[PDB]
Amino acid sequence: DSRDYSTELSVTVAVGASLLFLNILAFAALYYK
Amino acid sequence: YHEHYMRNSRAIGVLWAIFTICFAIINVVVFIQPYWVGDSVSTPKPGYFGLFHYCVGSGLAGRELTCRGSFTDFSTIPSSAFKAAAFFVLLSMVLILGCITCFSLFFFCNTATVYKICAWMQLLAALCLVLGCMIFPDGWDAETIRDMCGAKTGKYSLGDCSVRWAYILAIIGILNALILSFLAFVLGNRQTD
Amino acid sequence: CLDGKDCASFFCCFEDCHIRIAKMDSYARIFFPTAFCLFNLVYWVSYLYLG
Ligand SMILES: CCCCCCCC/C=C\CCCCCCCC(=O)O[C@H](COC(=O)CCCCCCCCCCCCCCC)COP(=O)(O)OC[C@@H](O)CO
Ligand SMILES: CCCCCCCCCCCC(=O)OC[C@H](COP(=O)([O-])O)OC(=O)CCCCCCCCCCC
Ligand SMILES: CC(C)CCC[C@@H](C)[C@H]1CC[C@H]2[C@@H]3CC=C4C[C@@H](O)CC[C@]4(C)[C@H]3CC[C@]12C
Ligand SMILES: CCCCCCCCCCCCCCCC(=O)O
Ligand SMILES: CCCCCCCCCC
Ligand SMILES: [Cl-]
């Protein structure tokens, strides 16, 4: 087994950034009067 | 304009609930899955460990990952720091599940009150998750963690091992929890219009 | 306090308080079933699939 963790961390950071960016879109819809 | 504002507020509330459920899923997954820290090529023995659970290899060119640890039995947890971190993460999970339960209160109670209740409870869950993530490294100086990772490890000293997906997902959960708390606060203060 | 809302005017309510405890039975009609269902969802997922 290749004992490296980059693709795993890559997908984890990707989904995390996706959820975070969705929440920033929620802020964008919110603060916009 | 009023109907547009009402539709936007309703949609943002629904999406906030969806993201709250997603963050609860994240909190449960990081609490359960033992992939907070992981071996490396320089590690003498292969294995990993979470908040409380830990699997280690025997070291005979095979996996044979003997797995020990359980939050339900505090004796098996390697260190007091691990116990405190696991307790804080459990408390955060309880808080977010409590807000998911309090979603039902939108039927009866005023929307501002329920929004602010989950705002405060998500804030407390975020602080508990921060405390757990800050206290968890203190137990790296435990004898079994040192044995697995190596002698270089210590309090706030990763050494040879590497942080795996669960720890970074927990950090993402902290960020998402703080964000959801702020979103709930602003939604509660905005629905009055 | 941009919104003129301080840490007691924006975040925490501190309004009135409770008063509406008379209809507290109505909350338990939905609160108790939800918490137990939520408890079952992660109790069984934790032991059967995740670990
Ligand atoms: C696997 C995970 C499972 C987790 C699921 C756990 C289930 C949790 C329990 C119940 C959820 C449903 C609750 C629905 C409540 C929504 C009820 C509602 O819409 O209320 C109205 C406000 O709308 C509003 O803007 C409030 C909007 C926010 C609502 C937030 C909850 C949405 C949940 C929708 C589910 C999405 C799908 C998720 C499935 C994965 C006004 O009301 P009403 O004038 O009459 O009086 C209120 C007072 O002010 C005066 O009496
Ligand atoms: C064996 C399982 C049987 C379950 C049968 C459930 C049928 C319940 C239908 C609800 C009927 C209804 O809406 O009227 C009751 C009250 C009316 O409002 P108010 O009088 O509380 O202000 O409504 C409410 O305010 C609270 C309604 C609570 C609904 C959730 C019930 C959950 C039942 C699942 C138990 C496993
Ligand atoms: C009352 C509502 C709002 C919240 C309920 C919280 C529930 C879901 C919490 C409280 C205690 C938790 C348990 C505490 C300890 C363990 C041992 C671990 O090895 C698997 C998860 C498991 C079994 C947890 C599952 C979730 C749990 C049952
Ligand atoms: C209706 C409210 C209760 C909601 C909770 C429903 C789940 C009850 C638990 C039933 C035990 C099921 C056992 C599952 C394990 C198995 O059979 O292999
Ligand atoms: C796919 C893993 C699912 C883990 C359980 C999620 C629990 C959500 C609690 C509402
Ligand atoms: Cl266990």
Contact B11, B138 (CB under 8 A): no
Structure tokens at B90: 């459990």
Which amino acid does the sequence have at B13?
G
Structure tokens at B63: 């996996």
Contact B123, B129 (CB under 8 A): no
Nearest CA to ligand 2 atom 18: C26
Nearest CA to ligand 5 atom 4: B25
Contact B100, C38 (CB under 8 A): yes
Method: cryo-EM
Residues of B with Cβ-Cβ distance to C42 under 8 angstroms:
28, 97
Kindly write down the DSSP assignment for every residue of B106-160, as one continuous string. Answer: GTTS-HHHHHHHHHHHHHHHHHHHHHHHHHGGGGGGSHHHHHHH-TT-BTTB-TT
- As for ligand 5, residues whose beta carbon falls within 6 Å of it are B 21, 24-25, 28-29, 100; C 38, 41-42, 45
Ligand closest to CA B108: 1
